[PDB]
PDB file of all heavy atoms in Angstrom:
ATOM      1  N   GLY A   1     -18.791  -5.467  37.794  1.00  0.00           N
ATOM      2  CA  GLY A   1     -18.056  -6.317  38.709  1.00  0.00           C
ATOM      3  C   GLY A   1     -16.581  -6.470  38.388  1.00  0.00           C
ATOM      4  O   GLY A   1     -15.999  -5.643  37.679  1.00  0.00           O
ATOM      5  N   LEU A   2     -15.968  -7.537  38.891  1.00  0.00           N
ATOM      6  CA  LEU A   2     -14.519  -7.711  38.846  1.00  0.00           C
ATOM      7  C   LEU A   2     -14.129  -8.436  37.565  1.00  0.00           C
ATOM      8  O   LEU A   2     -14.090  -9.667  37.525  1.00  0.00           O
ATOM      9  CB  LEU A   2     -14.035  -8.478  40.073  1.00  0.00           C
ATOM     10  CG  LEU A   2     -12.553  -8.340  40.422  1.00  0.00           C
ATOM     11  CD1 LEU A   2     -12.201  -6.900  40.755  1.00  0.00           C
ATOM     12  CD2 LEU A   2     -12.197  -9.269  41.568  1.00  0.00           C
ATOM     13  N   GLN A   3     -13.818  -7.674  36.522  1.00  0.00           N
ATOM     14  CA  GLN A   3     -13.258  -8.223  35.294  1.00  0.00           C
ATOM     15  C   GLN A   3     -11.759  -7.959  35.279  1.00  0.00           C
ATOM     16  O   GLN A   3     -11.325  -6.804  35.348  1.00  0.00           O
ATOM     17  CB  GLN A   3     -13.925  -7.618  34.059  1.00  0.00           C
ATOM     18  CG  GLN A   3     -15.424  -7.825  33.997  1.00  0.00           C
ATOM     19  CD  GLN A   3     -15.831  -8.705  32.831  1.00  0.00           C
ATOM     20  OE1 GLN A   3     -15.081  -8.859  31.866  1.00  0.00           O
ATOM     21  NE2 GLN A   3     -17.016  -9.296  32.918  1.00  0.00           N
ATOM     22  N   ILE A   4     -10.972  -9.027  35.191  1.00  0.00           N
ATOM     23  CA  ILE A   4      -9.518  -8.946  35.153  1.00  0.00           C
ATOM     24  C   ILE A   4      -9.070  -9.288  33.741  1.00  0.00           C
ATOM     25  O   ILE A   4      -9.404 -10.359  33.219  1.00  0.00           O
ATOM     26  CB  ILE A   4      -8.872  -9.889  36.182  1.00  0.00           C
ATOM     27  CG1 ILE A   4      -8.868  -9.243  37.566  1.00  0.00           C
ATOM     28  CG2 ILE A   4      -7.449 -10.227  35.776  1.00  0.00           C
ATOM     29  CD1 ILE A   4      -8.036  -7.993  37.645  1.00  0.00           C
ATOM     30  N   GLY A   5      -8.324  -8.379  33.121  1.00  0.00           N
ATOM     31  CA  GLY A   5      -7.940  -8.566  31.742  1.00  0.00           C
ATOM     32  C   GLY A   5      -6.583  -9.220  31.582  1.00  0.00           C
ATOM     33  O   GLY A   5      -5.722  -9.171  32.458  1.00  0.00           O
ATOM     34  N   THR A   6      -6.405  -9.848  30.429  1.00  0.00           N
ATOM     35  CA  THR A   6      -5.126 -10.410  30.018  1.00  0.00           C
ATOM     36  C   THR A   6      -4.372  -9.331  29.230  1.00  0.00           C
ATOM     37  O   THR A   6      -4.816  -8.181  29.260  1.00  0.00           O
ATOM     38  CB  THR A   6      -5.385 -11.732  29.288  1.00  0.00           C
ATOM     39  OG1 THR A   6      -6.203 -12.569  30.113  1.00  0.00           O
ATOM     40  CG2 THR A   6      -4.087 -12.489  29.038  1.00  0.00           C
ATOM     41  N   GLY A   7      -3.274  -9.629  28.536  1.00  0.00           N
ATOM     42  CA  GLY A   7      -2.464  -8.616  27.900  1.00  0.00           C
ATOM     43  C   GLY A   7      -3.079  -8.074  26.622  1.00  0.00           C
ATOM     44  O   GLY A   7      -4.285  -7.839  26.516  1.00  0.00           O
ATOM     45  N   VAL A   8      -2.214  -7.859  25.636  1.00  0.00           N
ATOM     46  CA  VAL A   8      -2.589  -7.259  24.364  1.00  0.00           C
ATOM     47  C   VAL A   8      -2.023  -8.108  23.235  1.00  0.00           C
ATOM     48  O   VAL A   8      -1.017  -8.807  23.398  1.00  0.00           O
ATOM     49  CB  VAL A   8      -2.091  -5.799  24.266  1.00  0.00           C
ATOM     50  CG1 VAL A   8      -0.590  -5.766  24.083  1.00  0.00           C
ATOM     51  CG2 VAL A   8      -2.785  -5.059  23.134  1.00  0.00           C
ATOM     52  N   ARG A   9      -2.689  -8.058  22.082  1.00  0.00           N
ATOM     53  CA  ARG A   9      -2.228  -8.753  20.893  1.00  0.00           C
ATOM     54  C   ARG A   9      -2.535  -7.894  19.672  1.00  0.00           C
ATOM     55  O   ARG A   9      -3.531  -7.148  19.674  1.00  0.00           O
ATOM     56  CB  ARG A   9      -2.888 -10.133  20.773  1.00  0.00           C
ATOM     57  CG  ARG A   9      -4.143 -10.186  19.921  1.00  0.00           C
ATOM     58  CD  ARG A   9      -4.740 -11.583  19.935  1.00  0.00           C
ATOM     59  NE  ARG A   9      -5.894 -11.699  19.052  1.00  0.00           N
ATOM     60  CZ  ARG A   9      -5.991 -12.574  18.061  1.00  0.00           C
ATOM     61  NH1 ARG A   9      -5.022 -13.435  17.799  1.00  0.00           N
ATOM     62  NH2 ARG A   9      -7.093 -12.588  17.315  1.00  0.00           N
ATOM     63  N   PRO A  10      -1.709  -7.948  18.628  1.00  0.00           N
ATOM     64  CA  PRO A  10      -2.015  -7.177  17.414  1.00  0.00           C
ATOM     65  C   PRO A  10      -3.129  -7.845  16.620  1.00  0.00           C
ATOM     66  O   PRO A  10      -3.119  -9.061  16.412  1.00  0.00           O
ATOM     67  CB  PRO A  10      -0.693  -7.170  16.639  1.00  0.00           C
ATOM     68  CG  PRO A  10       0.199  -8.151  17.299  1.00  0.00           C
ATOM     69  CD  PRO A  10      -0.411  -8.639  18.568  1.00  0.00           C
ATOM     70  N   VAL A  11      -4.095  -7.041  16.184  1.00  0.00           N
ATOM     71  CA  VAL A  11      -5.219  -7.544  15.405  1.00  0.00           C
ATOM     72  C   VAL A  11      -4.735  -7.859  14.000  1.00  0.00           C
ATOM     73  O   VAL A  11      -4.864  -8.994  13.523  1.00  0.00           O
ATOM     74  CB  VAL A  11      -6.378  -6.534  15.354  1.00  0.00           C
ATOM     75  CG1 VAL A  11      -7.255  -6.789  14.139  1.00  0.00           C
ATOM     76  CG2 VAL A  11      -7.192  -6.594  16.609  1.00  0.00           C
ATOM     77  N   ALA A  12      -4.170  -6.857  13.332  1.00  0.00           N
ATOM     78  CA  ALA A  12      -3.850  -6.948  11.919  1.00  0.00           C
ATOM     79  C   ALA A  12      -2.978  -5.776  11.497  1.00  0.00           C
ATOM     80  O   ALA A  12      -2.851  -4.775  12.210  1.00  0.00           O
ATOM     81  CB  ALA A  12      -5.122  -6.980  11.067  1.00  0.00           C
ATOM     82  N   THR A  13      -2.377  -5.916  10.319  1.00  0.00           N
ATOM     83  CA  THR A  13      -1.577  -4.860   9.716  1.00  0.00           C
ATOM     84  C   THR A  13      -2.323  -4.303   8.509  1.00  0.00           C
ATOM     85  O   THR A  13      -2.654  -5.045   7.578  1.00  0.00           O
ATOM     86  CB  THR A  13      -0.203  -5.385   9.309  1.00  0.00           C
ATOM     87  OG1 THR A  13       0.568  -5.673  10.482  1.00  0.00           O
ATOM     88  CG2 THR A  13       0.530  -4.356   8.470  1.00  0.00           C
ATOM     89  N   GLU A  14      -2.582  -3.000   8.527  1.00  0.00           N
ATOM     90  CA  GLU A  14      -3.323  -2.321   7.474  1.00  0.00           C
ATOM     91  C   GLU A  14      -2.401  -1.353   6.746  1.00  0.00           C
ATOM     92  O   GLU A  14      -1.615  -0.641   7.377  1.00  0.00           O
ATOM     93  CB  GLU A  14      -4.529  -1.574   8.047  1.00  0.00           C
ATOM     94  CG  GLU A  14      -4.259  -0.873   9.367  1.00  0.00           C
ATOM     95  CD  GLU A  14      -5.407   0.022   9.796  1.00  0.00           C
ATOM     96  OE1 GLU A  14      -6.438   0.046   9.090  1.00  0.00           O
ATOM     97  OE2 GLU A  14      -5.278   0.700  10.837  1.00  0.00           O
ATOM     98  N   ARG A  15      -2.496  -1.341   5.421  1.00  0.00           N
ATOM     99  CA  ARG A  15      -1.731  -0.402   4.617  1.00  0.00           C
ATOM    100  C   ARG A  15      -2.533   0.871   4.386  1.00  0.00           C
ATOM    101  O   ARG A  15      -3.759   0.894   4.524  1.00  0.00           O
ATOM    102  CB  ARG A  15      -1.363  -1.027   3.272  1.00  0.00           C
ATOM    103  CG  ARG A  15      -0.323  -2.122   3.359  1.00  0.00           C
ATOM    104  CD  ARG A  15      -0.264  -2.884   2.054  1.00  0.00           C
ATOM    105  NE  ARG A  15      -0.552  -4.299   2.250  1.00  0.00           N
ATOM    106  CZ  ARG A  15      -0.768  -5.160   1.266  1.00  0.00           C
ATOM    107  NH1 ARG A  15      -0.758  -4.779   0.000  1.00  0.00           N
ATOM    108  NH2 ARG A  15      -1.008  -6.433   1.562  1.00  0.00           N
ATOM    109  N   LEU A  16      -1.826   1.940   4.033  1.00  0.00           N
ATOM    110  CA  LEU A  16      -2.452   3.207   3.665  1.00  0.00           C
ATOM    111  C   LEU A  16      -2.339   3.339   2.151  1.00  0.00           C
ATOM    112  O   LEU A  16      -1.348   3.858   1.632  1.00  0.00           O
ATOM    113  CB  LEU A  16      -1.793   4.375   4.392  1.00  0.00           C
ATOM    114  CG  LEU A  16      -2.198   5.789   3.965  1.00  0.00           C
ATOM    115  CD1 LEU A  16      -3.517   6.184   4.604  1.00  0.00           C
ATOM    116  CD2 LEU A  16      -1.108   6.789   4.317  1.00  0.00           C
ATOM    117  N   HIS A  17      -3.353   2.850   1.441  1.00  0.00           N
ATOM    118  CA  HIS A  17      -3.361   2.892  -0.017  1.00  0.00           C
ATOM    119  C   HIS A  17      -3.797   4.281  -0.458  1.00  0.00           C
ATOM    120  O   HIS A  17      -4.973   4.522  -0.735  1.00  0.00           O
ATOM    121  CB  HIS A  17      -4.274   1.812  -0.585  1.00  0.00           C
ATOM    122  CG  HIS A  17      -3.617   0.472  -0.709  1.00  0.00           C
ATOM    123  ND1 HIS A  17      -2.670   0.196  -1.669  1.00  0.00           N
ATOM    124  CD2 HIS A  17      -3.770  -0.666   0.008  1.00  0.00           C
ATOM    125  CE1 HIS A  17      -2.268  -1.055  -1.542  1.00  0.00           C
ATOM    126  NE2 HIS A  17      -2.921  -1.601  -0.532  1.00  0.00           N
ATOM    127  N   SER A  18      -2.840   5.203  -0.521  1.00  0.00           N
ATOM    128  CA  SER A  18      -3.086   6.559  -0.981  1.00  0.00           C
ATOM    129  C   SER A  18      -2.039   6.912  -2.025  1.00  0.00           C
ATOM    130  O   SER A  18      -1.050   6.198  -2.208  1.00  0.00           O
ATOM    131  CB  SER A  18      -3.057   7.567   0.175  1.00  0.00           C
ATOM    132  OG  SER A  18      -1.730   7.970   0.463  1.00  0.00           O
ATOM    133  N   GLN A  19      -2.265   8.025  -2.712  1.00  0.00           N
ATOM    134  CA  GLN A  19      -1.400   8.440  -3.808  1.00  0.00           C
ATOM    135  C   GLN A  19      -0.090   8.983  -3.252  1.00  0.00           C
ATOM    136  O   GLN A  19      -0.085   9.963  -2.500  1.00  0.00           O
ATOM    137  CB  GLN A  19      -2.093   9.492  -4.675  1.00  0.00           C
ATOM    138  CG  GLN A  19      -1.193  10.077  -5.746  1.00  0.00           C
ATOM    139  CD  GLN A  19      -0.780   9.045  -6.773  1.00  0.00           C
ATOM    140  OE1 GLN A  19      -1.599   8.572  -7.557  1.00  0.00           O
ATOM    141  NE2 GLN A  19       0.499   8.688  -6.771  1.00  0.00           N
ATOM    142  N   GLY A  20       1.015   8.337  -3.617  1.00  0.00           N
ATOM    143  CA  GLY A  20       2.317   8.851  -3.248  1.00  0.00           C
ATOM    144  C   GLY A  20       2.775   9.949  -4.189  1.00  0.00           C
ATOM    145  O   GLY A  20       2.287  10.086  -5.311  1.00  0.00           O
ATOM    146  N   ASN A  21       3.729  10.746  -3.718  1.00  0.00           N
ATOM    147  CA  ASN A  21       4.236  11.855  -4.513  1.00  0.00           C
ATOM    148  C   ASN A  21       4.988  11.339  -5.731  1.00  0.00           C
ATOM    149  O   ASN A  21       5.715  10.343  -5.651  1.00  0.00           O
ATOM    150  CB  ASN A  21       5.140  12.744  -3.660  1.00  0.00           C
ATOM    151  CG  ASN A  21       4.356  13.647  -2.729  1.00  0.00           C
ATOM    152  OD1 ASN A  21       3.215  14.007  -3.015  1.00  0.00           O
ATOM    153  ND2 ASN A  21       4.964  14.012  -1.609  1.00  0.00           N
ATOM    154  N   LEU A  22       4.811  12.018  -6.861  1.00  0.00           N
ATOM    155  CA  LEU A  22       5.432  11.597  -8.108  1.00  0.00           C
ATOM    156  C   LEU A  22       6.848  12.147  -8.217  1.00  0.00           C
ATOM    157  O   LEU A  22       7.153  13.223  -7.696  1.00  0.00           O
ATOM    158  CB  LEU A  22       4.598  12.070  -9.300  1.00  0.00           C
ATOM    159  CG  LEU A  22       3.182  11.499  -9.398  1.00  0.00           C
ATOM    160  CD1 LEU A  22       2.424  12.138 -10.549  1.00  0.00           C
ATOM    161  CD2 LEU A  22       3.223   9.990  -9.550  1.00  0.00           C
ATOM    162  N   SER A  23       7.713  11.398  -8.894  1.00  0.00           N
ATOM    163  CA  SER A  23       9.089  11.809  -9.144  1.00  0.00           C
ATOM    164  C   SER A  23       9.396  11.643 -10.623  1.00  0.00           C
ATOM    165  O   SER A  23       9.117  10.589 -11.203  1.00  0.00           O
ATOM    166  CB  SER A  23      10.070  10.988  -8.301  1.00  0.00           C
ATOM    167  OG  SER A  23      11.405  11.216  -8.714  1.00  0.00           O
ATOM    168  N   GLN A  24       9.976  12.676 -11.228  1.00  0.00           N
ATOM    169  CA  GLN A  24      10.305  12.662 -12.650  1.00  0.00           C
ATOM    170  C   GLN A  24      11.679  12.029 -12.827  1.00  0.00           C
ATOM    171  O   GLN A  24      12.683  12.556 -12.339  1.00  0.00           O
ATOM    172  CB  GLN A  24      10.273  14.074 -13.227  1.00  0.00           C
ATOM    173  CG  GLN A  24      10.795  14.171 -14.651  1.00  0.00           C
ATOM    174  CD  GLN A  24      10.182  15.323 -15.421  1.00  0.00           C
ATOM    175  OE1 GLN A  24       9.263  15.135 -16.215  1.00  0.00           O
ATOM    176  NE2 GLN A  24      10.696  16.527 -15.191  1.00  0.00           N
ATOM    177  N   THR A  25      11.726  10.895 -13.531  1.00  0.00           N
ATOM    178  CA  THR A  25      12.970  10.156 -13.738  1.00  0.00           C
ATOM    179  C   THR A  25      13.409  10.335 -15.188  1.00  0.00           C
ATOM    180  O   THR A  25      14.462   9.857 -15.615  1.00  0.00           O
ATOM    181  CB  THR A  25      12.786   8.685 -13.382  1.00  0.00           C
ATOM    182  OG1 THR A  25      13.884   7.926 -13.902  1.00  0.00           O
ATOM    183  CG2 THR A  25      11.489   8.160 -13.974  1.00  0.00           C
ATOM    184  N   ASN A  26      12.578  11.050 -15.947  1.00  0.00           N
ATOM    185  CA  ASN A  26      12.844  11.350 -17.351  1.00  0.00           C
ATOM    186  C   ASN A  26      13.180  10.097 -18.151  1.00  0.00           C
ATOM    187  O   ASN A  26      14.123  10.097 -18.948  1.00  0.00           O
ATOM    188  CB  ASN A  26      13.980  12.368 -17.467  1.00  0.00           C
ATOM    189  CG  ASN A  26      13.802  13.307 -18.642  1.00  0.00           C
ATOM    190  OD1 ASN A  26      12.719  13.849 -18.858  1.00  0.00           O
ATOM    191  ND2 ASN A  26      14.868  13.503 -19.409  1.00  0.00           N
ATOM    192  N   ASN A  27      12.419   9.027 -17.945  1.00  0.00           N
ATOM    193  CA  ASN A  27      12.629   7.765 -18.642  1.00  0.00           C
ATOM    194  C   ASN A  27      11.350   7.367 -19.365  1.00  0.00           C
ATOM    195  O   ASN A  27      10.269   7.367 -18.770  1.00  0.00           O
ATOM    196  CB  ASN A  27      13.048   6.667 -17.666  1.00  0.00           C
ATOM    197  CG  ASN A  27      14.077   5.724 -18.257  1.00  0.00           C
ATOM    198  OD1 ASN A  27      14.894   6.121 -19.088  1.00  0.00           O
ATOM    199  ND2 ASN A  27      14.040   4.466 -17.832  1.00  0.00           N
ATOM    200  N   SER A  28      11.479   7.021 -20.647  1.00  0.00           N
ATOM    201  CA  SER A  28      10.316   6.642 -21.438  1.00  0.00           C
ATOM    202  C   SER A  28       9.699   5.328 -20.980  1.00  0.00           C
ATOM    203  O   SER A  28       8.550   5.042 -21.329  1.00  0.00           O
ATOM    204  CB  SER A  28      10.693   6.548 -22.917  1.00  0.00           C
ATOM    205  OG  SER A  28      11.396   5.348 -23.188  1.00  0.00           O
ATOM    206  N   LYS A  29      10.432   4.526 -20.208  1.00  0.00           N
ATOM    207  CA  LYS A  29       9.957   3.213 -19.796  1.00  0.00           C
ATOM    208  C   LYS A  29       9.299   3.209 -18.423  1.00  0.00           C
ATOM    209  O   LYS A  29       8.792   2.164 -18.000  1.00  0.00           O
ATOM    210  CB  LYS A  29      11.120   2.216 -19.800  1.00  0.00           C
ATOM    211  CG  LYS A  29      12.107   2.432 -20.936  1.00  0.00           C
ATOM    212  CD  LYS A  29      12.827   1.149 -21.308  1.00  0.00           C
ATOM    213  CE  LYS A  29      13.946   1.418 -22.304  1.00  0.00           C
ATOM    214  NZ  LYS A  29      14.647   0.170 -22.708  1.00  0.00           N
ATOM    215  N   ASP A  30       9.292   4.340 -17.720  1.00  0.00           N
ATOM    216  CA  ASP A  30       8.728   4.396 -16.374  1.00  0.00           C
ATOM    217  C   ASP A  30       7.339   5.020 -16.418  1.00  0.00           C
ATOM    218  O   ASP A  30       7.154   6.101 -16.989  1.00  0.00           O
ATOM    219  CB  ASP A  30       9.650   5.182 -15.447  1.00  0.00           C
ATOM    220  CG  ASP A  30      11.025   4.557 -15.327  1.00  0.00           C
ATOM    221  OD1 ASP A  30      11.337   3.645 -16.121  1.00  0.00           O
ATOM    222  OD2 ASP A  30      11.796   4.973 -14.436  1.00  0.00           O
ATOM    223  N   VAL A  31       6.367   4.344 -15.809  1.00  0.00           N
ATOM    224  CA  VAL A  31       4.976   4.778 -15.796  1.00  0.00           C
ATOM    225  C   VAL A  31       4.518   4.906 -14.351  1.00  0.00           C
ATOM    226  O   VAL A  31       4.889   4.095 -13.496  1.00  0.00           O
ATOM    227  CB  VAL A  31       4.062   3.801 -16.566  1.00  0.00           C
ATOM    228  CG1 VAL A  31       2.770   4.489 -16.969  1.00  0.00           C
ATOM    229  CG2 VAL A  31       4.778   3.244 -17.782  1.00  0.00           C
ATOM    230  N   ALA A  32       3.713   5.929 -14.076  1.00  0.00           N
ATOM    231  CA  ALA A  32       3.176   6.173 -12.747  1.00  0.00           C
ATOM    232  C   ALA A  32       1.655   6.205 -12.799  1.00  0.00           C
ATOM    233  O   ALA A  32       1.062   6.617 -13.799  1.00  0.00           O
ATOM    234  CB  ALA A  32       3.703   7.488 -12.168  1.00  0.00           C
ATOM    235  N   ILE A  33       1.030   5.772 -11.710  1.00  0.00           N
ATOM    236  CA  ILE A  33      -0.418   5.742 -11.608  1.00  0.00           C
ATOM    237  C   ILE A  33      -0.870   6.963 -10.820  1.00  0.00           C
ATOM    238  O   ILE A  33      -0.316   7.304  -9.774  1.00  0.00           O
ATOM    239  CB  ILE A  33      -0.953   4.443 -10.951  1.00  0.00           C
ATOM    240  CG1 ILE A  33      -0.449   3.191 -11.675  1.00  0.00           C
ATOM    241  CG2 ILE A  33      -2.471   4.449 -10.921  1.00  0.00           C
ATOM    242  CD1 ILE A  33       0.914   2.718 -11.219  1.00  0.00           C
ATOM    243  N   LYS A  34      -1.897   7.638 -11.337  1.00  0.00           N
ATOM    244  CA  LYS A  34      -2.476   8.788 -10.662  1.00  0.00           C
ATOM    245  C   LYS A  34      -3.696   8.447  -9.818  1.00  0.00           C
ATOM    246  O   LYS A  34      -4.072   9.249  -8.956  1.00  0.00           O
ATOM    247  CB  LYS A  34      -2.853   9.873 -11.687  1.00  0.00           C
ATOM    248  CG  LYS A  34      -3.248  11.216 -11.091  1.00  0.00           C
ATOM    249  CD  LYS A  34      -4.038  12.049 -12.082  1.00  0.00           C
ATOM    250  CE  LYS A  34      -4.394  13.406 -11.500  1.00  0.00           C
ATOM    251  NZ  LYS A  34      -5.106  14.257 -12.491  1.00  0.00           N
ATOM    252  N   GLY A  35      -4.302   7.278 -10.011  1.00  0.00           N
ATOM    253  CA  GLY A  35      -5.483   6.915  -9.252  1.00  0.00           C
ATOM    254  C   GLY A  35      -5.305   5.713  -8.347  1.00  0.00           C
ATOM    255  O   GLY A  35      -4.448   5.718  -7.460  1.00  0.00           O
ATOM    256  N   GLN A  36      -6.116   4.675  -8.561  1.00  0.00           N
ATOM    257  CA  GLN A  36      -6.168   3.546  -7.638  1.00  0.00           C
ATOM    258  C   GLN A  36      -6.129   2.225  -8.400  1.00  0.00           C
ATOM    259  O   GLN A  36      -6.920   1.314  -8.132  1.00  0.00           O
ATOM    260  CB  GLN A  36      -7.414   3.611  -6.752  1.00  0.00           C
ATOM    261  CG  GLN A  36      -8.672   4.041  -7.488  1.00  0.00           C
ATOM    262  CD  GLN A  36      -8.890   5.539  -7.452  1.00  0.00           C
ATOM    263  OE1 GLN A  36      -8.100   6.279  -6.867  1.00  0.00           O
ATOM    264  NE2 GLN A  36      -9.962   5.996  -8.087  1.00  0.00           N
ATOM    265  N   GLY A  37      -5.209   2.104  -9.359  1.00  0.00           N
ATOM    266  CA  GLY A  37      -5.096   0.906 -10.165  1.00  0.00           C
ATOM    267  C   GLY A  37      -3.781   0.185  -9.917  1.00  0.00           C
ATOM    268  O   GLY A  37      -2.879   0.701  -9.254  1.00  0.00           O
ATOM    269  N   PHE A  38      -3.702  -1.024 -10.469  1.00  0.00           N
ATOM    270  CA  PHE A  38      -2.526  -1.871 -10.345  1.00  0.00           C
ATOM    271  C   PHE A  38      -2.141  -2.419 -11.713  1.00  0.00           C
ATOM    272  O   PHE A  38      -2.992  -2.636 -12.580  1.00  0.00           O
ATOM    273  CB  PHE A  38      -2.765  -3.045  -9.383  1.00  0.00           C
ATOM    274  CG  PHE A  38      -2.910  -2.639  -7.945  1.00  0.00           C
ATOM    275  CD1 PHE A  38      -4.159  -2.583  -7.352  1.00  0.00           C
ATOM    276  CD2 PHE A  38      -1.797  -2.333  -7.181  1.00  0.00           C
ATOM    277  CE1 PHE A  38      -4.298  -2.218  -6.030  1.00  0.00           C
ATOM    278  CE2 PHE A  38      -1.932  -1.967  -5.856  1.00  0.00           C
ATOM    279  CZ  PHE A  38      -3.182  -1.911  -5.281  1.00  0.00           C
ATOM    280  N   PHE A  39      -0.844  -2.644 -11.897  1.00  0.00           N
ATOM    281  CA  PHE A  39      -0.352  -3.372 -13.055  1.00  0.00           C
ATOM    282  C   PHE A  39      -0.393  -4.869 -12.783  1.00  0.00           C
ATOM    283  O   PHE A  39      -0.060  -5.328 -11.687  1.00  0.00           O
ATOM    284  CB  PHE A  39       1.078  -2.963 -13.413  1.00  0.00           C
ATOM    285  CG  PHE A  39       1.217  -1.538 -13.851  1.00  0.00           C
ATOM    286  CD1 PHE A  39       2.054  -0.670 -13.173  1.00  0.00           C
ATOM    287  CD2 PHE A  39       0.543  -1.075 -14.967  1.00  0.00           C
ATOM    288  CE1 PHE A  39       2.197   0.637 -13.586  1.00  0.00           C
ATOM    289  CE2 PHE A  39       0.677   0.233 -15.379  1.00  0.00           C
ATOM    290  CZ  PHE A  39       1.506   1.090 -14.687  1.00  0.00           C
ATOM    291  N   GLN A  40      -0.798  -5.629 -13.793  1.00  0.00           N
ATOM    292  CA  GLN A  40      -0.869  -7.081 -13.699  1.00  0.00           C
ATOM    293  C   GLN A  40       0.315  -7.696 -14.431  1.00  0.00           C
ATOM    294  O   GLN A  40       0.511  -7.445 -15.624  1.00  0.00           O
ATOM    295  CB  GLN A  40      -2.181  -7.599 -14.285  1.00  0.00           C
ATOM    296  CG  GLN A  40      -2.283  -9.114 -14.330  1.00  0.00           C
ATOM    297  CD  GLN A  40      -3.604  -9.590 -14.903  1.00  0.00           C
ATOM    298  OE1 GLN A  40      -4.428  -8.787 -15.341  1.00  0.00           O
ATOM    299  NE2 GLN A  40      -3.811 -10.901 -14.902  1.00  0.00           N
ATOM    300  N   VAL A  41       1.101  -8.499 -13.716  1.00  0.00           N
ATOM    301  CA  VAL A  41       2.250  -9.188 -14.284  1.00  0.00           C
ATOM    302  C   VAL A  41       2.072 -10.682 -14.062  1.00  0.00           C
ATOM    303  O   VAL A  41       1.270 -11.113 -13.229  1.00  0.00           O
ATOM    304  CB  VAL A  41       3.584  -8.699 -13.678  1.00  0.00           C
ATOM    305  CG1 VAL A  41       3.598  -7.186 -13.578  1.00  0.00           C
ATOM    306  CG2 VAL A  41       3.809  -9.328 -12.314  1.00  0.00           C
ATOM    307  N   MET A  42       2.821 -11.474 -14.823  1.00  0.00           N
ATOM    308  CA  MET A  42       2.729 -12.926 -14.766  1.00  0.00           C
ATOM    309  C   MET A  42       3.965 -13.491 -14.079  1.00  0.00           C
ATOM    310  O   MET A  42       5.093 -13.242 -14.519  1.00  0.00           O
ATOM    311  CB  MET A  42       2.580 -13.520 -16.165  1.00  0.00           C
ATOM    312  CG  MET A  42       1.848 -14.848 -16.203  1.00  0.00           C
ATOM    313  SD  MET A  42       2.198 -15.790 -17.699  1.00  0.00           S
ATOM    314  CE  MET A  42       3.952 -15.485 -17.892  1.00  0.00           C
ATOM    315  N   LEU A  43       3.749 -14.247 -13.011  1.00  0.00           N
ATOM    316  CA  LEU A  43       4.824 -14.942 -12.330  1.00  0.00           C
ATOM    317  C   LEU A  43       5.292 -16.131 -13.165  1.00  0.00           C
ATOM    318  O   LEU A  43       4.563 -16.615 -14.033  1.00  0.00           O
ATOM    319  CB  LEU A  43       4.355 -15.405 -10.954  1.00  0.00           C
ATOM    320  CG  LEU A  43       4.094 -14.296  -9.935  1.00  0.00           C
ATOM    321  CD1 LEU A  43       3.410 -14.855  -8.698  1.00  0.00           C
ATOM    322  CD2 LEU A  43       5.391 -13.596  -9.563  1.00  0.00           C
TER     323      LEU A  43
END
């Protein structure tokens, strides 16, 4: 039958948690993750 729709709204924002390309900065203090982990810091 006669269904009349209203407009549109965004549901949500989703990130693409995938491995980004690595860059060599030649610094002993810079660390990169190869898998799916996070560093924990204290605010």
